[PDB]
């Protein structure tokens, strides 16, 4: 028929398939270092919270970058904080043990269904798989 401008198909998603087991294997076989903190600087409330998870320190780094980048403190916006801070810290003390989150091992989500087993390079021909190898 006709085209219709779809930001949901030229928007960077990159999160439906971001699995922590694959990302951990990539960090293992990365062959370039990882920017870890000086060891005491990443625990949070004198140990009343966790250490902090890798996603939490990534998000903290993003927030401080945006913070310094346009000179604005973030706030105590009530609905978003009563959702995200309390639910986040309660699943943090549920699943984050010693700076490592073990929540994923208790979660049904198929690895190979979404994040592996390529869909575009599906190679549904003997000739296409032969040319993809050679």
């Amino acid at each position: 028929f006709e085209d219709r401008f779809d930001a949901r198909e030229h928007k960077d998603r990159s999160n439906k398939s971001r699995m922590q087991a694959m990302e951990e294997y990539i960090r293992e076989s990365s062959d370039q270092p990882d920017w870890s903190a000086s060891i005491g600087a990443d625990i949070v409330n004198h140990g009343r919270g966790g250490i902090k998870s890798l996603r939490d320190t990534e998000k903290e780094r993003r927030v401080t970058s945006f913070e310094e980048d346009n000179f604005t403190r973030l706030n105590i916006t009530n609905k978003a904080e009563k959702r995200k801070q309390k639910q986040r810290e309660r699943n943090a003390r549920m699943n984050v043990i010693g700076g490592e989150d073990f929540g994923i091992f208790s979660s049904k989500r198929k690895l190979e269904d979404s994040t592996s087993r390529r869909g575009a390079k599906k190679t549904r021909s003997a000739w296409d798989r032969a040319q993809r190898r050679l």
Partner: protein
């Protein structure tokens, strides 16, 4: 956390007696919390064993699980197999907390001296003073547990009892 199945059998009572006495715990909730999340950990590793070799779930979640267990420190570097996650147990998890570790490193004379040092803030891993006893130190924070520099057992100015006794003996 969650309570066990038969919470009052005599083996469980002598178990909790030995655990709380050997690790200086305050009540049953420490054992029950760390055993609940250990139950989740090795209930997951059981399923990772019940699936087969060269399964994607088994390969990636297995080496992920044993590497973050090694980095928590309950599993040593050489046993990189997934049946040691099943051999893991509860005192392997609560030997990693900061009270146990302060006593084992010898900054305290017992686990109770370690608990009161931690709650009186004389102990800092790395940069920050940790002040709760159940902290689960990691394999990289294992060697920077030392006395806080803000504390008289470090090198700081002595506390109120020492300075008041010094002042009254100067009077």
């Amino acid at each position: 956390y969650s309570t066990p199945k038969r919470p009052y059998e005599s083996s469980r009572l002598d178990a909790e007696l030995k655990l709380a006495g050997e690790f200086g715990l305050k009540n049953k909730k420490e054992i029950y919390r760390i055993s609940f999340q250990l139950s989740k950990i090795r209930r997951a590793a059981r399923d990772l064993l019940t699936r087969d070799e060269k399964d994607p779930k088994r390969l990636f979640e297995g080496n992920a699980l044993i590497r973050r267990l090694v980095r928590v420190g309950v599993l040593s570097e050489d046993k990189k197999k997934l049946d040691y996650v099943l051999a893991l147990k509860v005192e392997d998890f609560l030997e990693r907390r900061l009270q146990t570790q302060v006593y084992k490193l010898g900054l305290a004379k017992s686990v109770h001296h370690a608990r009161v040092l931690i709650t009186q803030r004389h102990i800092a891993v790395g940069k920050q003073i940790v002040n709760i006893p159940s902290f689960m130190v990691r394999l990289d924070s294992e060697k920077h547990i030392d006395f806080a520099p803000t504390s008289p057992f470090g090198g700081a100015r002595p506390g109120r009892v020492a300075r008041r006794n010094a002042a009254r003996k100067a009077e």
